[PDB]
Structures are given as structure tokens and as C-alpha cells.
Amino acid sequence: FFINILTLLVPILIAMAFLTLVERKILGYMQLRKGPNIVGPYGILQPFADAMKLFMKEPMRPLTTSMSLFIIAPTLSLTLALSLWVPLPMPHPLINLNLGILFILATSSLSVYSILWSGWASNSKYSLFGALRAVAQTISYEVTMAIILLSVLLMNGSYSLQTLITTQEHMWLLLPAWPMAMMWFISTLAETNRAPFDLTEGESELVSGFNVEYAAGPFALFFMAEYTNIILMNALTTIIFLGPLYYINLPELYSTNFMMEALLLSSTFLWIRASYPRFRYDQLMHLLWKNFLPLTLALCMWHISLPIFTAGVPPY
Amino acid sequence: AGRISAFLKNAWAKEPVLVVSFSVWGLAIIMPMISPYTKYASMINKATPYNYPVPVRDDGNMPDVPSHPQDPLGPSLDWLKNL
Amino acid sequence: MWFEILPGLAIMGVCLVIPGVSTAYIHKFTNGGKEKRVARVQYQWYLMERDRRISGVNRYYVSKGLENI
Amino acid sequence: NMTLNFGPQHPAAHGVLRLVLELSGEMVRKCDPHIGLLHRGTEKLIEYKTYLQALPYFDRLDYVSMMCNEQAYSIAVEKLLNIQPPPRAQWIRVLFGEITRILNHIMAVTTHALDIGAMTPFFWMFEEREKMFEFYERVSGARMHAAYIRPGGVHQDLPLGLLDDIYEFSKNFSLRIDEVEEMLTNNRIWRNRTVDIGVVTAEDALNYGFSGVMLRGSGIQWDLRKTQPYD
Amino acid sequence: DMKSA
Amino acid sequence: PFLDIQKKLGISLDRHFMFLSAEQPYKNAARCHAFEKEWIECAHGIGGTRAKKECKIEFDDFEECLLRYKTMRRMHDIKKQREKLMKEGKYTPPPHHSGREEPRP
Amino acid sequence: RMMRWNQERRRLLIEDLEARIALMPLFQAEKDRRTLQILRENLEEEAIIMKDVPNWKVGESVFHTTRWVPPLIGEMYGLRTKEEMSNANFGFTWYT
Amino acid sequence: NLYTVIFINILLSLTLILVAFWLPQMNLYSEKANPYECGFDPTSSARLPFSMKFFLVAITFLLFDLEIALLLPLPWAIQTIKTSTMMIMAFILVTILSLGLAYEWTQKGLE
Amino acid sequence: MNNYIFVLSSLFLVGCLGLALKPSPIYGGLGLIVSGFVGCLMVLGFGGSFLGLMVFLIYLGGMLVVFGYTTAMATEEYPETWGSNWLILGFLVLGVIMEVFLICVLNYYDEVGVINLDGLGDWLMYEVDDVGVMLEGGIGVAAMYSCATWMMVVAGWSLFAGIFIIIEITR
């Protein structure tokens, strides 16, 4: 078990730093630059040097802060994002939780709490604006997050995340739910806090939002939890709305199908990050609550309608 | 009819989101009156054995229920497995 | 050109294709050549406990077939 | 109401500005800008020097539109001295002043996009800005601060074969302008961002001293190029 | 028309 | 008062989950369903005041089934006397309670 | 295709549940033979334990009626080891 | 398993916090640890009453959170015998959940 | 894991003590998020995984919205922490001394009452059905869709009228 949690947790941190590496490289390729290829063999050494350098960067204990809550926020954010990864289905999950997608939804609702704890306990007006817009991003994302995670999972009929693997062996899940996939994508941009719907760590809005007072290793923990949440909910959109091929004798073909589909989905996540202009929280609350909340409730109505329209109800 | 048709035509041009939510909500309204499969899910959920159906005491009144499981006379599911 | 994203994406890719393969192979190693049974309901856990007691070495992964009796 | 200082160091204030905002909520009540964080005393310092020594201030005052301001200062000095420029130098004035117009509008669209949050024409337009600063360095020898427009016409001639490279820049610049117009005008984010926000009346745009692109955004026709013919 | 809609 | 709207209409808005022995989602039994059913079938047609005197044995038996208080006292006393006999030395080490037992099946 | 997959998956669950509904009285005959044996092991090692303390009958149940009270987790496995007790009461729940 | 992954995850995050703290040098001063408002003396305390304007939308989030909590047992609710009963009443429930937002959108509650 | 729910309910008593001695409500929101996580694994150790996890989700969302409310409106110049006032920290020390005295008097002083501390672990769940399939509490929560439809209708009308309540109050 300990060898399994080492080979799950240490390669996901190395792959998260290498995701930051290929994020900056494909982001700079979008912005017509070659990217950080000098310091590594084709640049395979730069966010490892960032995670090294932010250790002996000086941390900050300000006058105005409360230091216990100020230091208990990023350690809970790292524990949060690295223990959100364990009810992921994969071929076979490490935690075979019976209703684990509600734990995913609950700890992603916990993911928009450590940012508010940080933005209060930093004791800056800038961090307080970032904390209030993190509350506004909760107000935006959370009910449409739960309704998209409810209504298309009513077609699977169970909150066990293992039962979605057997559902979509021959066909994908974006073919029965194409508006639900793109509305899940634009709500998971709000939970992930990436540059379409990033409104609480922005250099043009505030001075980087909620990371005003956070230097060094705690800022490395917040960046760690940030990019762990990026690859995490890329894997969530991968594991719900697209269906890879399952052979029960060969899970490795399923894992490399997961690899190519998750690499194109993380490529379109950082492509949709680096393309668009960045929102304002008035029209974020306006387009979600006025436009995309009754569309989620109406496709939720149509997902009430479908198992009595045909075929019976799904299995337990 | 033309005034309300120009109202719903211009709403689907300008802001079609609420009116397509209302359209598929009315489609979910008009679903189960003309749905032919709407009386099958309740008897499928009746036919699944979540509990143990308690075997009855044999008293020899009539063979309304079978005295043997695997012979197909009795309440079967052969029109449900062919669905 | 567009070649330079690909070895960084491949060294991200081996670090993202390790964990599911590693947990499936270590599931095969830890549970008798089989996989770990998921207990969604209590019937699977009672069958799990009856297999642990039937094997009798307090381990469920070996299983007694027709050759026990 | 918090008396929040917006601060120079926040990068959407362009490095310099102390706004203060007595804001209730995030609905900002009043915003009081104390400019003066970059006050250099150029109008005091111009007096103690000669005119040709007073030329390269106007490289640096509007520093994202340089050769337009030394065109302005040298057309003021030439109107003081009653000296007409030569017409080849006048076409050099309007050509490099419209390279400077493309410069300032690239910075305007770019820093507007960076302040909203579109970080993409902070690099895509800046590659063609580096292509223009090759021409700036070809004529003067400095990428930004030329001091190439003098009183009595421009300083030197162009290097040879420049105008072919200006033409090969300008045939390729139009697809990138249409590309940014594809990426940032027809989209939904900018359409949600920039509608019925910050409207000024034409009475306020005349009475507030607004000029140029503020007046053209308010709809009145007041370019200073065809209404007042200079150069 | 309907096509623009 | 009581005002008896569900009693007049005959439809149970909340009367069908009043007790522990009510109908269940796919018939999975509550604990001491037999005890609560015997107490309700004792208590029907006698009233509350005479139900206190007449079904006192059935109420005490059902309350002992639910709270398990004398069962808790019985397990606590047998664990205390097992602990005292283990300190005394009369008690053998239990083969069926030491983990070395033959498991059935 | 979701209709065809839902109907074949409900046929698969009703096949596995038909195997369960034919398999329960082998499980139930296993269940009452163990829970009478572990209670008889509790009754055997009650007369060894409390033969000295007065007014306490062995095999005593405080319930008044002669019907079979269902045995609890505590009354079933409370005399056994703490590891087997935690594996009984935290078995399905902590297998996570 | 979930307890030991939460325990070893918070222990690795705690030793990441400890190797953030005790590995560099330790030297602070008052101008260093002064709070940040782009480098200025405090015009006001940050802990002051903020009169933000998304308050009714925030309470509508709390009521919609409660509404999706009663919506949440639906994959077990679809496995029932009274399919038409749960169908008509759940249609009524999510219809009035949409109708509360329809009244807020009519009466300008989301601005 | 025999004394798991007892040490969780002792942590619940410590967190409810930290809420009970009443700081500035930011620290009360942090302590009540801690106690809501404690109650989440308290229900999630019993066997019903749906109830405590969905009220963990509800208390995370509602505690986040009242946390934004108490960093918006209800704050002052000097926030009172648990350690900023010595009455609060001294009452915390007196409260944990009182709970040590309470488990002392329920452990070895008289040992008379319905509350027992020798009964740890085995009197946690009294009887759970081992062979049945429908033992997960999600269908028990989902019983309000089929059998208990009236209180479901009542609660949905309550939140409809509550949306009308908040749009009547906050204008």
C-alpha cells in the first residue's frame, strides 16, 4: 500500500511540475515563443528548479496576520489537492469509495475555502478582494457544478465512480451529452480558476489576487495545489464525459488511451486558458445564473425525463 | 399568432438560452403522455430482486404461483429480456 | 518548429501513464493474481469475509475451489 | 468605505498611477487619481537648454508614440522660425509618424487586452512591433528614442533598401490586424465586457477636454489630420 | 430571417 | 388542537413513518421491529394510561431492545469479571477469543 | 446506445441478483450456524468466568419474551479480540 | 485507507511547510513584514465593514445549495417502484427551483 | 479504531467549545468547518456514507458564504482570536479540564448511569444487516421521493417561499 501511494503521489507531483513545464511551453508556443528550453534538455528542468528555489526563498510572517491560520491554509490546500486525487477511477482506484464523486464534489467545495482563508489571513485589502471574488466564484460555479455532476450521472445511475468505466466502453459520453460537456468545461474552468474564469488570482485585476502576502514555500504549495487541480479536473472531465476503450485483460491500452485523451484535454485546457480574455465577476454571475443555470436545470429536467422515456432506470 | 411568433422568433435570435430551456422543459412536459416505454421502468424496478421474496406456504387452492422456479409457467420475464 | 513541445510532453506522459498501470499491477501482485474486489454493498463484503474465513489463513486472495472437499 | 490606494506597482495602472478609491463594495464610488509619481520637471528642464538639446524630451514623454511628439515639437519650432520642411522630408514625417501611429495603437490594443486579461496580443502584436523597431533602429540607431525628426526636416536619410522592407512588413501586417480583429472583436467575452460600460456623452467629451480617439469613440469627427492640415 | 436566427 | 385533517381525509401525509415498525425502502428491517410491532399491537385499543399499566413488560422489553442498557451492563460486568479473573490467574487464555480459533466456515 | 446499454446492464444486474437470490439460503444456513456457535462459545466461557459472583445465571437474557432476539455485534463478538471486533464493526465501512 | 492517505498527505504537507520555514535563513524586519497595498502606509485597516453588493445572490446560492442537496438522492430515487410519483413531484420541485430564479431574474435579484 | 468515534466526538466537543466561547466569527467559521469535517467522518464511520458527506458539502458551501459574510460585514478593527483574549483561552483550558474531569468521573469514580466509557467500540452500531444489498443510506434519504413525498413537497415549497422571503427582505 505504501509503495502504491508513493508511486501514485510522487509521480503525480513530478507530472504536475512537468505539466507546469508543458503549460509554459505550449502557452509560449501559442504566444509564438520557443519556451524554456535552455535550462534543461529541451527544457525538462525548469519547474523542478522553481520548486527547489522557492524552498530557500524567504517565507513571510507579517505584522498584521494571524500566523496559525496563515500557515494552516496552504498545507490544507496541498493536502486537499493531493487527497482529491485518490478517488479517481483510473483502471482500478486506490480508494474504492462507494459514493466517491460526492467526496470529489465536497473536497472541490473545500478547494474554494483555503483561498478565502488565505485572503482573509493575509490581512491585505487586495487579498480581501481576492477572497471576496473567491466567494463570488463559489456563488458562480457550485450549483451548476452539482447539477452537471448530478444529471449526466443519473444516466449512469450511481455515485460510485468505478461504475462509469463500464458504462462507456464502446461509445463516449459526450455523444449522449454534448451541451453538458462544454458547460462542465466552463464550470470546471471556474473551479480550476483558469484564465477565462480566473477572477481571484489575476495580475490585471489585483496584485495576483489571494497570493499577495504569500512568498516562498506556501506560495509553492498554493501553486502546487493550483496545478494539481488543473490536471485533476482535466482527469475529471476525461473520466466522465469521454469514454476510452476498456479491455479487462489489458488495462494498459485503456491507460494509454487515457494518456492521449487526457493530453489533448489538458492541451485544450491550457489552450482555452491562453486564448481568451479574462472575465469580470458581474457577467460571470450573470451568464452562469441567468443563462447557464436554467439550461443546466432544463437538461436536468430532460435527464429526469430520459429513464422514463426509455429503457428503464440504470443499475445500482 | 403572428405577434407571439415574432416574439418567439426574435427571442431565439437575441437571447435563445431561456427560450431553448423553456422549449426542452416543454418537451419534458409532453414526453410521458406519448411515451410508449413509460410503463416499463416501474415493472422493471418491481421485477428486480432487491429483497428475498418469501416462498409461500403450499395449501393447494389453485396454481396461481409456481411450485418450482425454473419451469417457465408463472410470472416470467421473457418479454422483458427481449427488449 | 513544433517538435520542441513533444519530449517535454513525453516526459510528462510517462509520469502520467505510470500510476494506473502501477496500481493495477500492484493490485495483481497484492491480491493473489486477481484484483481487489470493490465492496459497493454489504453482500460483497459478506462474501469477502466468507472467503477470508474459508481460506482460513486470514487472507482472502487465495480461494478454495472444488478441490477443498 | 475603504480608502484603497490602487498603487503604482499593480501592473494595470501602467506602473505609475496612484489612484485612490473610496469604494463601498466593489462598486466604486469615486476614484481620485494623484498623478505625479513620474514628475520629472521636463518643462523646467527644457528652458535651461538649447532647442536641439530640448529635442529628445519628446522621444520620452509619450514613450509609446515617440516620433509623433518630435514631429509635434519640430513643427512648433518650424512654425516659430517660419521654415517649411522639404517635401521628401515631409513624406518621411508622415511615413514614420504613421509607423508611430501603428506603434501607439498596437500598444493601445495590447495594453487594453492585457488589462482586460487577453494576454495573447501582448506577444502577437509585439513580434510585429519588434519588426517595426528594426526599422526604427535602421533609421536612427535606437529602438525607441530616435530624435530623428529635427527642426528643418529630419536628420539623416534612410538606409538603402529600406522601403522594400517597409512594403514587405505592410503586406504581412494586414493579416495580423485581421487576425486580432477575428480573435478579440467577434468573441463573446469582450462583447460581454465592453457593452454599456464607461459611456461618455458628447457634451462631456467636449467639456472634459477629451480629444482624439475619445472624441472618435464619442462619435464626433475630429481628427487633427484632415480638419487641420499639418505636414 | 429564420436562417439568421 | 389535534384537528384530525389526515384522519378525516384518510391519506397519510406523515402517519406512514411515525414509528420504528413502519414500511421501509425495499423492506429492510429496522432494529427491534418485532418488539415495536408487538408493543403497538399491545397498545392498540387500550389507550395510553392503561397501556402504561398493561404493556409495561412489553414497553420495558422494547426499551431494553433499543437502548440495550441491561445488555450493556451485562457485557460490562462480564468484561470486568474476565479482567479480574485474568489478573487473578483462574482464567485460561481463550482459544476461541485469542485469534487462534478454527473459523467457521 | 445508452438505451441498449441500460437494458443490457439491467439484464446483467438481474442475472447477478438472480444468482444472489439463489445463493442466499446457503448464506443464511451459514449465518445462523455461526451466530449460534459464537453465542454458545460465549455461554461456555461465561460459566468459567462468573461461577463465583452470585445472583447471575449463565445464558441469561434480560428480554422478557421467549422469541429469538437478534444478536448484536457487541453481544456476538464482544468477548473476542479487538482486531476481530474492529474488523466486524468497521468492516464494510472502512474498506475504502 | 482514506484516513492513512489523509494522514500521510497532511504529514508530507507539514514537512513541506517545515522545509519551507527552517531551510532558508531567518531575518525579518518591520518594513519587510509590513502588509502590501503596493507599498504604502495603511490608509485603513483591512478588517473593516465591506458593503458588497452580491448579497442577495449569495443567499440565493445558499438556497440553491439546499435545493441541490434535496436533488442529490436522485440516482437512488430513480430505483423505486413509484416512478410516476417521484417523476411528477420531482418535476414540480425542480420546476419551482427554476421558478425562484425566474422571479429573481424578473425582479432584478441577480444584479 | 475501537475508540475512533469516541475520540472524534471528543474533538467535536473541543470544536463546539471553540465555537461556544465565541471569538470573532471568522475563527468560529474555521472551528465549525473543523467540527463539520469531524461530523462528516463521524457519520462516515457509522456506515451511511451519503448523509454526513452531503452535509459536509452543505456546511462547506454555507460556511463559505457566511465566512464571506463575516469577512464582509461583521468585523472590527482588532479581531478577537482564541488566544488574543485570556478569558477565552483560560475558558478553553477550564473546558478541557472539565471534560478531563467528566471522562474521569465517568471512567472510575462511581461508574453508575446509562453513559459508560468501558463500553467502547462494541456499542457503536447495534445491528447492521450483513447479507442484504440495500443497506447504503442513499435509498433511505431517497425515500422522500417515493414514500415520504409530503415533507419533500413541504421543503421544496419552503425554499420557493424562502427565495421570495430573501427577495422581500433584501430590497
Place this chain on the structure above:
Amino acid sequence: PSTFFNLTMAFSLSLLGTLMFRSHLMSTLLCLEGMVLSLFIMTSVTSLNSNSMSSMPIPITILVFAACEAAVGLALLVKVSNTYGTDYVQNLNLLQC
């Protein structure tokens, strides 16, 4: 048993917290929410120990009227806080007239 006695000791301390006022009425709303949280924990351990699945959405309707009542009190404190500036209960001394 012991978990329920520690639950009712947490409820008695939550009642001692909500039957006094120290700084704000917001912290009294927080005390009422912790009170109804431990009430939920009591309701779920009774309805889970008794193995009664019929009384299991009684915690759902308890949380519905809990968070709806806290929602009503938050709109109430919005109105009294933007009336009074700060929402202290010691400023509420004009109802004795």
C-alpha cells in the same frame, strides 16, 4: 452512548454559547449553525443505529430548515448591518422606548 453524551454536552455548550452575546450576532448565528450541526449528528446516529431508512430524510428536512433559517438570519443581518454600520448587539438599545 458515550458519543451521544458528548453530543449532548456539545449541544449544552452550544446552548450556553447562543444564550449569551459577546461580540456580534453573526457569531450567534454561527453558534446556532453548530447547534443544528450537532443536532444533525444526533439525528443521523439515531436513524443509523436504529437501521430505519424511513426516518433518514428527516436529517435532510432538518438541514433544509436549518440553512433556510440561517439564510433568513443572514438577510436580516444584511439589513441591520447596512442600517447600523456595524452589527453589534450593544447598539440595539432603542426598543425600550
Place this chain on the structure above:
Amino acid sequence: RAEYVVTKLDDLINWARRSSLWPMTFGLACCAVEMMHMAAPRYDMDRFGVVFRASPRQADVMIVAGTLTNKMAPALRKVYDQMPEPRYVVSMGSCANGGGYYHYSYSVVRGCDRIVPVDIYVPGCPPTAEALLYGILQLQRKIKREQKLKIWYRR
């Protein structure tokens, strides 16, 4: 002989700081458009691994571009003090060098060396983005060649 181990760990602990140096999204200048020209994809920041982070707490080095006036001077130094103690100063521009233009003016600080410790001086009112790429490379090799664990070992 642990001095080789100390110097190799010092080069390994300075390799991360010389490679992944994070500057500050600064302003204050005519010269500050050339920070954006290093950001521009001809003479690139991010190829060497240079990322414009707005916060001082995220920043590792302040590139002071240009005009340092008397109103901006406590706003400069209150930002620079709150930058945490791995901190270097590049001074882009002759106004950040010595008060290049506006030297004998009334409200310009006469160089940024008057206020902050400046580790490297970049000349130019255009400093070319090649020239501040040289400044980033030479500050990079300066904090490479500083020896903190070596002077800790012979202490």
C-alpha cells in the same frame, strides 16, 4: 574533505536561483517598454525562465526600469523591503542608473543606487532587449558565483 561537497551543493542551490529567477512586473519608465520587449517573442524572457510575477512575494528580483522620482521613492522602497530576502536589483535605464535624464531636475532621485542596493547596472535609454538579456545573464552568473554555503563553511 567536505569542501567539494559544500561547493557542489552551493552550485546546485544557486543553479535553481540562476535558472528559475522570477522578476517583478514593474513600470515607472519610458524604458519600461523594453521589459515588455524582453517579454516579446524576439528576445525572450521565458526561454531563460523569467516570469513577470506582479507580487513582490512571488518576485525574486526587481528590474527597476527608469525614472525614479521623489514621490515614487517611498513607494519604491516599501515595495523593495517587502520583497523577501532572496532579492536582487537590476536597474534598467540611465534614470535607474544615475538619474540619466532629469539629473539636475528638482523631483528625480539621482539613480536607484541612492535607495536600494543595486546588483547590476544596465545602461541605455534604450537598453536593448539583447542588453537586458545580457543583464539577466550577468546577474544570473553573479548569483551563480556568489558562495553562501562556502562562506557558511569557513565561518
